[PDB]
Amino acid sequence: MVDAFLGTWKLVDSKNFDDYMKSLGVGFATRQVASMTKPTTIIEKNGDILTLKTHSTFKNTEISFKLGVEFDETTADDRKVKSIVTLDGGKLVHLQKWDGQETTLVRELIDGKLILTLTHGTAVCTRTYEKEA
Ligand SMILES: CCCCCCCCC(=O)O
């Protein structure tokens, strides 16, 4: 179900990430640095447990979760959120909730590239990742 998402992915295109970060209240200096990083995202499974690593020269994160089971998460920008990840229409949908706010992180495979769509408020960011061999 999740298996074509698995592997190591590198950022190769980003649209509106500053808008997304600014909507979340990320400070200008953090948004500068983040606008020039190209993270590596690593998605692995072990049975029902998925681990998603995001690595860069600026911030690293790692989460582990079971699909469809809520988990606590502390995001790269230090939000303490309630999260759930599920498959919906073949897309991996990550919903974060905190302080009555939500944001979605939706991953879809198109022509072998992983497209991550980030939505918070009205801001919609699209980031494209290509698979590492
Ligand atoms: C400044 C941090 C905003 C939340 C995480 C952004 C994740 C983006 C990515 O995985 O490409």
From Swiss-Prot:
Pfam families: Lipocalin. It comes from the Eukaryota. One of its GO terms (molecular function) is long-chain fatty acid transmembrane transporter activity. It is found in: Cytoplasm. InterPro entries: Calycin (IPR012674), Fatty_acid-bd (IPR000463), ILBP (IPR031259), Lipocln_cytosolic_FA-bd_dom (IPR000566). The modification Phosphoserine is found at residues 23, 83. GO terms for cellular component: cytosol; extracellular exosome; extracellular space; nucleus; sarcoplasm. (9Z)-octadecenoate binds at residues 127-129. The modification N-acetylvaline is found at residue 2. Its main location: cytoplasm. The modification Phosphothreonine is found at residues 8, 30. Keywords: Acetylation, Cytoplasm, Lipid-binding, Phosphoprotein, Transport. GO terms for biological process: brown fat cell differentiation; cholesterol homeostasis; fatty acid metabolic process; intracellular lipid transport; long-chain fatty acid transport; negative regulation of cell population proliferation; phospholipid homeostasis; positive regulation of long-chain fatty acid import into cell. Belongs to the calycin superfamily. Fatty-acid binding protein (FABP) family. Forms a beta-barrel structure that accommodates the hydrophobic ligand in its interior. This is Fatty acid-binding protein, heart. It comes from Homo sapiens (Human). The gene is FABP3.
